[PDB]
Design a protein around this motif. Sequence first.
Motif, PDB file in Angstrom:
ATOM      1  N   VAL A 148       1.819  32.814 -18.628  1.00 53.92           N
ATOM      2  CA  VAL A 148       3.230  33.144 -18.774  1.00 53.92           C
ATOM      3  C   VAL A 148       3.360  34.056 -19.982  1.00 53.92           C
ATOM      4  O   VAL A 148       2.780  33.779 -21.037  1.00 53.92           O
ATOM      5  CB  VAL A 148       4.091  31.876 -18.950  1.00 53.92           C
ATOM      6  CG1 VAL A 148       5.546  32.240 -19.209  1.00 53.92           C
ATOM      7  CG2 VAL A 148       3.959  30.967 -17.729  1.00 53.92           C
ATOM      8  N   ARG A 149       4.094  35.154 -19.833  1.00 52.94           N
ATOM      9  CA  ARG A 149       4.266  36.079 -20.939  1.00 52.94           C
ATOM     10  C   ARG A 149       5.733  36.163 -21.335  1.00 52.94           C
ATOM     11  O   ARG A 149       6.630  35.777 -20.581  1.00 52.94           O
ATOM     12  CB  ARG A 149       3.720  37.472 -20.600  1.00 52.94           C
ATOM     13  CG  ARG A 149       4.531  38.278 -19.604  1.00 52.94           C
ATOM     14  CD  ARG A 149       3.966  39.690 -19.541  1.00 52.94           C
ATOM     15  NE  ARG A 149       4.802  40.610 -18.784  1.00 52.94           N
ATOM     16  CZ  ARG A 149       4.459  41.860 -18.496  1.00 52.94           C
ATOM     17  NH1 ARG A 149       3.312  42.375 -18.910  1.00 52.94           N
ATOM     18  NH2 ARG A 149       5.291  42.613 -17.782  1.00 52.94           N
TER      19      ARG A 149
ATOM     20  N   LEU B 177      10.941  34.053 -20.507  1.00 57.51           N
ATOM     21  CA  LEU B 177       9.611  33.722 -20.019  1.00 57.51           C
ATOM     22  C   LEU B 177       9.397  34.349 -18.649  1.00 57.51           C
ATOM     23  O   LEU B 177      10.298  34.360 -17.805  1.00 57.51           O
ATOM     24  CB  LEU B 177       9.439  32.202 -19.931  1.00 57.51           C
ATOM     25  CG  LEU B 177       9.616  31.387 -21.214  1.00 57.51           C
ATOM     26  CD1 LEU B 177       9.783  29.914 -20.877  1.00 57.51           C
ATOM     27  CD2 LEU B 177       8.430  31.589 -22.149  1.00 57.51           C
ATOM     28  N   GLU B 178       8.191  34.860 -18.420  1.00 57.15           N
ATOM     29  CA  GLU B 178       7.849  35.511 -17.160  1.00 57.15           C
ATOM     30  C   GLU B 178       6.565  34.896 -16.627  1.00 57.15           C
ATOM     31  O   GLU B 178       5.500  35.060 -17.231  1.00 57.15           O
ATOM     32  CB  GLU B 178       7.697  37.020 -17.349  1.00 57.15           C
ATOM     33  CG  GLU B 178       7.348  37.775 -16.082  1.00 57.15           C
ATOM     34  CD  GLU B 178       7.574  39.270 -16.217  1.00 57.15           C
ATOM     35  OE1 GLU B 178       7.197  39.839 -17.264  1.00 57.15           O
ATOM     36  OE2 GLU B 178       8.136  39.872 -15.280  1.00 57.15           O
ATOM     37  N   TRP B 179       6.664  34.190 -15.499  1.00 58.94           N
ATOM     38  CA  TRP B 179       5.494  33.575 -14.881  1.00 58.94           C
ATOM     39  C   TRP B 179       4.631  34.655 -14.247  1.00 58.94           C
ATOM     40  O   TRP B 179       5.106  35.419 -13.400  1.00 58.94           O
ATOM     41  CB  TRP B 179       5.929  32.552 -13.833  1.00 58.94           C
ATOM     42  CG  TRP B 179       4.831  31.649 -13.321  1.00 58.94           C
ATOM     43  CD1 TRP B 179       4.414  30.467 -13.873  1.00 58.94           C
ATOM     44  CD2 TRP B 179       4.028  31.847 -12.148  1.00 58.94           C
ATOM     45  NE1 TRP B 179       3.400  29.924 -13.119  1.00 58.94           N
ATOM     46  CE2 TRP B 179       3.146  30.748 -12.054  1.00 58.94           C
ATOM     47  CE3 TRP B 179       3.969  32.843 -11.168  1.00 58.94           C
ATOM     48  CZ2 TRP B 179       2.215  30.621 -11.021  1.00 58.94           C
ATOM     49  CZ3 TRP B 179       3.046  32.712 -10.142  1.00 58.94           C
ATOM     50  CH2 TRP B 179       2.183  31.607 -10.077  1.00 58.94           C
ATOM     51  N   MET B 180       3.360  34.714 -14.642  1.00 61.10           N
ATOM     52  CA  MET B 180       2.452  35.744 -14.156  1.00 61.10           C
ATOM     53  C   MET B 180       1.566  35.257 -13.021  1.00 61.10           C
ATOM     54  O   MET B 180       1.338  35.994 -12.056  1.00 61.10           O
ATOM     55  CB  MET B 180       1.569  36.257 -15.297  1.00 61.10           C
ATOM     56  CG  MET B 180       2.329  36.922 -16.428  1.00 61.10           C
ATOM     57  SD  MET B 180       1.247  37.263 -17.829  1.00 61.10           S
ATOM     58  CE  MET B 180       0.207  38.539 -17.133  1.00 61.10           C
ATOM     59  N   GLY B 181       1.065  34.034 -13.113  1.00 65.30           N
ATOM     60  CA  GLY B 181       0.206  33.503 -12.078  1.00 65.30           C
ATOM     61  C   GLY B 181      -0.444  32.225 -12.555  1.00 65.30           C
ATOM     62  O   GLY B 181      -0.261  31.798 -13.698  1.00 65.30           O
ATOM     63  N   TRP B 182      -1.214  31.617 -11.653  1.00 63.69           N
ATOM     64  CA  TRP B 182      -1.957  30.418 -12.011  1.00 63.69           C
ATOM     65  C   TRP B 182      -3.221  30.335 -11.168  1.00 63.69           C
ATOM     66  O   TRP B 182      -3.401  31.078 -10.200  1.00 63.69           O
ATOM     67  CB  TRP B 182      -1.083  29.153 -11.885  1.00 63.69           C
ATOM     68  CG  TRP B 182      -0.826  28.579 -10.495  1.00 63.69           C
ATOM     69  CD1 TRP B 182      -1.357  28.987  -9.305  1.00 63.69           C
ATOM     70  CD2 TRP B 182       0.036  27.474 -10.185  1.00 63.69           C
ATOM     71  NE1 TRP B 182      -0.883  28.205  -8.278  1.00 63.69           N
ATOM     72  CE2 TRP B 182      -0.026  27.270  -8.793  1.00 63.69           C
ATOM     73  CE3 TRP B 182       0.850  26.637 -10.954  1.00 63.69           C
ATOM     74  CZ2 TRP B 182       0.698  26.269  -8.152  1.00 63.69           C
ATOM     75  CZ3 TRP B 182       1.569  25.641 -10.316  1.00 63.69           C
ATOM     76  CH2 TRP B 182       1.487  25.465  -8.931  1.00 63.69           C
TER      77      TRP B 182
ATOM     78  N   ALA C 106       9.123  31.422 -10.564  1.00 60.43           N
ATOM     79  CA  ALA C 106       9.956  32.196 -11.472  1.00 60.43           C
ATOM     80  C   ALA C 106      10.606  31.278 -12.496  1.00 60.43           C
ATOM     81  O   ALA C 106      10.966  30.136 -12.190  1.00 60.43           O
ATOM     82  CB  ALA C 106      11.034  32.977 -10.715  1.00 60.43           C
ATOM     83  N   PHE C 107      10.752  31.798 -13.710  1.00 64.15           N
ATOM     84  CA  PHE C 107      11.637  31.215 -14.704  1.00 64.15           C
ATOM     85  C   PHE C 107      13.016  31.842 -14.565  1.00 64.15           C
ATOM     86  O   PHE C 107      13.155  32.977 -14.101  1.00 64.15           O
ATOM     87  CB  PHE C 107      11.114  31.449 -16.125  1.00 64.15           C
ATOM     88  CG  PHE C 107       9.877  30.666 -16.462  1.00 64.15           C
ATOM     89  CD1 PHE C 107       9.974  29.375 -16.957  1.00 64.15           C
ATOM     90  CD2 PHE C 107       8.620  31.226 -16.301  1.00 64.15           C
ATOM     91  CE1 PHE C 107       8.838  28.650 -17.272  1.00 64.15           C
ATOM     92  CE2 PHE C 107       7.482  30.508 -16.615  1.00 64.15           C
ATOM     93  CZ  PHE C 107       7.590  29.220 -17.101  1.00 64.15           C
ATOM     94  N   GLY C 108      14.036  31.093 -14.963  1.00 70.79           N
ATOM     95  CA  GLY C 108      15.383  31.625 -14.970  1.00 70.79           C
ATOM     96  C   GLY C 108      15.586  32.645 -16.078  1.00 70.79           C
ATOM     97  O   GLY C 108      14.747  32.836 -16.960  1.00 70.79           O
ATOM     98  N   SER C 109      16.743  33.310 -16.027  1.00 70.11           N
ATOM     99  CA  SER C 109      17.062  34.337 -17.016  1.00 70.11           C
ATOM    100  C   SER C 109      17.213  33.770 -18.426  1.00 70.11           C
ATOM    101  O   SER C 109      17.172  34.537 -19.394  1.00 70.11           O
ATOM    102  CB  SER C 109      18.332  35.087 -16.610  1.00 70.11           C
ATOM    103  OG  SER C 109      19.422  34.199 -16.430  1.00 70.11           O
TER     104      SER C 109
END
Lengths: 12, 223, 211
Positions: B37-38, B45-50, C96-99
Motif C-alpha cells: 500500500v502506498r 492510502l492506495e492499495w497496490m496488490g498482495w 480499494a481504500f476510500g478517499s
Amino acid sequence: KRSFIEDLLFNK
Amino acid sequence: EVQLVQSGPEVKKPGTSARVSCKASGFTSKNTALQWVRQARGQPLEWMGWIDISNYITNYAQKFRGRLTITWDLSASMAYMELSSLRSEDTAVYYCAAVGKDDDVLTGGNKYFDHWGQGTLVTVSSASTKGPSVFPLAPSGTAALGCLVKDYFPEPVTVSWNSGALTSGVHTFPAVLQSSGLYSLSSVVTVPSSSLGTQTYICNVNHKPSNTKVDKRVEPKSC
Amino acid sequence: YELTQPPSVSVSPGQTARITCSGDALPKKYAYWYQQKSGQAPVLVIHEDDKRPSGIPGRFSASSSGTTATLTISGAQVEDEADYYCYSTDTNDNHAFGSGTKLTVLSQPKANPTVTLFPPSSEELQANKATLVCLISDFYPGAVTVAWKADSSPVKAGVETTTPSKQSNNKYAASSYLSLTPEQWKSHRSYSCQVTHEGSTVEKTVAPTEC
C-alpha cells in the motif's frame, strides 16, 4: 488464479 | 511475536525500478496475505496488490498491472515489491502489511489479524545535490513576511530568523517536491507593522547536503 | 473500484462522530476501517463491517447497510483525532481504500483563515523564475481547499500545496505555490488564490502592474 483469502476476508 | 521490517528510504531516477523489501517474521497461518500500500504526501492510502504467501497467487490493482511485481521468498521470510518505469508521481511512502485469519486454538474460533510495516519512502527524482535559492517575501495591525527557499535537493533545510533571536509568530512550512524533482519550502513570520523599516528581519537558511548557508534580509516594499 | 468518504468531519469532545463510506459492492463485500495519525502507519479499528479488534476502545463501532458503511465513534476523545479510511473490494476482486476522512475533535471555536498572497520577488524574476506564494494562517479546523486563477481562469499546472500544519498558537497554517515563467507572469492581468474553509471562500489577488 484466485486466492481463497479474497473470499475469506470479504465475502458477506 | 510477528514482525514486519521494511528496507530504508531510497532515491530513484525516473525510468528506473524500485525494489522494496519487507521481512515478515512469525506468520505461519495458511491464510496469510502480504499486501503493498502506498501513500503520497497528503494523499489517501492506495492499495497496490498482495500475494497469498501459501500459494504465491498475486492480485495487482489495475493501475499497476504491467509495472508491479510482488514476490515472497519463503527461505528468507522476505516479501518484495518491484515497481518499474518509475515516474515523479510514484514518490510516496510504500507500506507492507500482513492480513488474514488465524485458527485461534484458545477460544476455538478464528481471529483476523492485521499488521503493518514502518513504511519505505521512495523518492523519484533525477536531481543531484543542489543548494537552495532564497528569495524574500516582502510585506507592504500586523504584517506577514518571509523567505522562499526554492529548488534544493535533498531534504532537509533548516530556517531561523535573526539568528534565532526571533521565534514568536514564526512558521516554517514543510517542503513540497516539485515536478522538477527539487524541493521548495517557505518560512514566514508575523510582525508588528510599526516595526517594518526599523527592525531588520533576516532569515537564516542552512542546507547541509550542499554545505549552503544563506542569510537573506527581508525588506518592506513601499508599493 | 471507488469508495467515497466525506473529506472532513468535525465532532465535539464527548459527542458522536459518524463517517460514511459509499461503495457499490458493500452489500456483498465486507468493509474494514483504518485509523491513521501523522507519521504513522494505519491502524485497524474495525474489521468485517462491525467487528471490533481486541485493542480498540468500546466507543468504536461500525455497521454496513446498502451501499453505505458507517464508522461510529461514540463519546469522541482527543486521541480519536486522525484520518480514517474505509477499505473493501468489488465483485471482480478490485481492492480499494476510500478517499479518506480527516476527523477533527474540536478543541477551540472555528477560526477563519488569513490569506496573504506574495507576488514573485524581483530577485526570483532576475533568476528567470516566478513563484506566487499564498500564505494561509490562523484557521481552525485544519481543513482547507486551495484553488488558483489566472485572469478568472482556473489554473491546475504548476501548483503545489502543503498539508495544513499546526501553528504554535494551536491554529493551522498552509502554503500554496504557483510556479510560472517571468513571461507568463507578465502576460496575465491578475492572479488569484482562493481558499475555502468551512464552506466560505476567501480570495486574494495580485497584479503584475501593481508593483
